[PDB]
Design an enzyme around this catalytic site. Structure first.
Site, PDB file in Angstrom:
ATOM      1  CG  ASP A 116       3.681   7.424   5.067  1.00  0.00           C
ATOM      2  OD1 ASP A 116       3.037   8.136   4.216  1.00  0.00           O
ATOM      3  OD2 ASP A 116       4.833   7.274   4.997  1.00  0.00           O
TER       4      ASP A 116
ATOM      5  NE  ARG B   4       5.432   7.477  -0.031  1.00  0.00           N
ATOM      6  CZ  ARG B   4       4.378   8.517  -0.150  1.00  0.00           C
ATOM      7  NH1 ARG B   4       4.052   9.016  -1.160  1.00  0.00           N
ATOM      8  NH2 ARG B   4       3.910   9.068   1.147  1.00  0.00           N
ATOM      9  CG  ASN B   5       4.623   3.697   2.325  1.00  0.00           C
ATOM     10  OD1 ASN B   5       5.800   4.094   2.034  1.00  0.00           O
ATOM     11  ND2 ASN B   5       4.073   5.146   2.814  1.00  0.00           N
TER      12      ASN B   5
ATOM     13  CG  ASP C 127       7.662   2.325   4.693  1.00  0.00           C
ATOM     14  OD1 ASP C 127       7.351   3.039   5.457  1.00  0.00           O
ATOM     15  OD2 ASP C 127       8.589   2.229   4.091  1.00  0.00           O
TER      16      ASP C 127
HETATM   17  N1  ADP Z   1       9.456  -6.896   1.074  1.00  0.00           N
HETATM   18  C1  ADP Z   1       9.937  -6.309  -0.247  1.00  0.00           C
HETATM   19  N2  ADP Z   1      10.151  -7.048  -1.426  1.00  0.00           N
HETATM   20  C2  ADP Z   1      10.222  -6.382  -2.585  1.00  0.00           C
HETATM   21  N3  ADP Z   1      10.546  -5.338  -2.800  1.00  0.00           N
HETATM   22  C3  ADP Z   1      10.509  -4.267  -1.584  1.00  0.00           C
HETATM   23  C4  ADP Z   1      10.331  -4.972  -0.536  1.00  0.00           C
HETATM   24  N4  ADP Z   1      10.398  -3.938   0.433  1.00  0.00           N
HETATM   25  C5  ADP Z   1      10.646  -2.848  -0.263  1.00  0.00           C
HETATM   26  N5  ADP Z   1      10.753  -3.145  -1.620  1.00  0.00           N
HETATM   27  C6  ADP Z   1      11.157  -2.042  -2.472  1.00  0.00           C
HETATM   28  O1  ADP Z   1      12.517  -1.854  -2.485  1.00  0.00           O
HETATM   29  C7  ADP Z   1      12.936  -0.459  -2.889  1.00  0.00           C
HETATM   30  C8  ADP Z   1      13.589   0.356  -1.540  1.00  0.00           C
HETATM   31  O2  ADP Z   1      12.821   0.203  -0.486  1.00  0.00           O
HETATM   32  P1  ADP Z   1      12.780   1.554   0.828  1.00  0.00           P
HETATM   33  O3  ADP Z   1      13.946   2.675   0.123  1.00  0.00           O
HETATM   34  O4  ADP Z   1      13.211   0.972   2.138  1.00  0.00           O
HETATM   35  O5  ADP Z   1      11.545   2.084   0.525  1.00  0.00           O
HETATM   36  P2  ADP Z   1      10.255   2.224   1.570  1.00  0.00           P
HETATM   37  O6  ADP Z   1      10.407   3.129   2.677  1.00  0.00           O
HETATM   38  O7  ADP Z   1       8.927   2.553   0.666  1.00  0.00           O
HETATM   39  O8  ADP Z   1      10.071   0.544   2.190  1.00  0.00           O
HETATM   40  C9  ADP Z   1      11.560   0.314  -3.104  1.00  0.00           C
HETATM   41  O9  ADP Z   1      11.113   0.021  -4.582  1.00  0.00           O
HETATM   42  C10 ADP Z   1      10.758  -0.600  -2.500  1.00  0.00           C
HETATM   43  O10 ADP Z   1       9.108  -0.633  -2.824  1.00  0.00           O
END
Ligand code: ADP
Length: 308
Positions: free
Chosen positions: A157, A161-162, A178
């Site tokens: 994946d 976005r990941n 991700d």
């Molecule tokens: N380690 C991190 N630091 C900052 N922002 C993050 C981090 N991990 C995830 N995010 C952000 O917080 C939001 C929610 O994450 P989530 O819904 O679990 O999506 P994903 O499955 O892509 O991680 C998204 O905008 C994601 O990009």
């Protein structure tokens, strides 16, 4: 209590770093999502005054199944067992209070797709983004992908976005952040909690959506699409097409055009990532060396980015 195995020793929740609940403070919601929240927070080791640890906190909703719970735990395990500068660090977990927390490296520049969209050269706000910024991010992720490949982990994946960035300004480092899809297939044999509408078919090679075959050459294909995402500055792959159109197009030999202003050398790399036969696709060591060649070429790195 399910185990996880990587490179190729074994682990279980017992091997996760449990941080005292009282040490974790949540500062702000960082978007969130549909299943679980993400916060910027602090862990005040040991507890102190400061300098505390800055973290992203992923929550498990408290109304969830037993399987959801195991899925959350599994993600923790997968992430904690990596050791790569281009893969987000897991700082620990807080599993013994509800709601459950995973604590990750705080990635201040946010996700890659959003960063690109948000920093596209515009005027008003000038051009504080150039071709080498894009190449470095591509190298960063290629570097992480190569570490997965060498340790026989299929991501499944790869997608802007990941990916996340350490910060917005220069000095940023891009990392894979991700592993939800990898986790899912690890947990059942297949995409049980998904379905067809949830598959990332636009990032998948023909043998993957046709046969359900995944190898490290399927990540290669995904990476090619990521590149296009990067060099288009955060456009959706195959701009006008639906999932089915894309699956039909790609199956019959169709491939995306270069993004606006994309240097030939970069595009050549995407087209090799999208060879029909997986055996014809480069591995990540070849991809890296190729992105470094692009880096060295003044004609590529001197190319202006479009202004929409
Ligand atoms: N380690 C991190 N630091 C900052 N922002 C993050 C981090 N991990 C995830 N995010 C952000 O917080 C939001 C929610 O994450 P989530 O819904 O679990 O999506 P994903 O499955 O892509 O991680 C998204 O905008 C994601 O990009």
């Amino acid at each position: 209590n399910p185990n996880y195995c990587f490179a190729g020793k074994t682990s279980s929740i017992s091997d996760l770093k449990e941080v005292p609940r009282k040490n974790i403070t949540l500062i702000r919601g960082l978007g969130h999502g549909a299943f679980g929240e993400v916060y910027e927070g602090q862990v005040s080791g040991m507890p102190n005054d400061p300098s505390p640890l800055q973290v992203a906190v992923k929550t498990l909703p408290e109304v969830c199944s037993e399987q959801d719970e195991l899925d959350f735990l599994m993600e923790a395990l997968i992430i904690s067992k990596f050791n790569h500068q281009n893969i987000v660090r897991c700082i620990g977990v807080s599993l013994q209070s509800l709601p459950r927390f995973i604590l990750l490296e705080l990635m201040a520049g946010g996700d890659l797709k959003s960063f690109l969209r948000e920093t596209r050269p515009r005027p008003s706000q000038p051009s504080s983004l150039a071709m080498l910024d894009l190449l470095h991010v591509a190298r960063d992720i290629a570097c992480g992908c190569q570490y997965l490949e060498e340790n026989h982990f299929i991501h499944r994946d790869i997608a802007a976005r990941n990916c996340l960035l350490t910060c917005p300004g220069p000095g940023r480092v891009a990392k894979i952040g991700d592993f939800g899809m990898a986790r899912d297939i690890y947990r059942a044999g297949y995409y049980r909690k998904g379905g067809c509408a949830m598959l990332p078919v636009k990032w998948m090679p023909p043998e993957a959506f046709m046969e359900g075959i995944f190898t490290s050459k399927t990540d290669t294909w995904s990476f090619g699409v990521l590149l296009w995402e990067i060099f288009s500055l955060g456009y959706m792959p195959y701009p006008s097409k639906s999932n089915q159109e894309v699956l039909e197009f790609v199956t019959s030999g169709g491939r995306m055009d270069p993004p606006k202003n994309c240097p030939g050398p970069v595009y050549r790399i995407m087209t090799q990532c999208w060879q029909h036969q997986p055996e014809d696709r480069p591995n990540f060591a070849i991809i890296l060396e190729r992105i470094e060649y692009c880096t060295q070429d003044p004609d590529v790195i001197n190319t202006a980015l479009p202004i929409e």
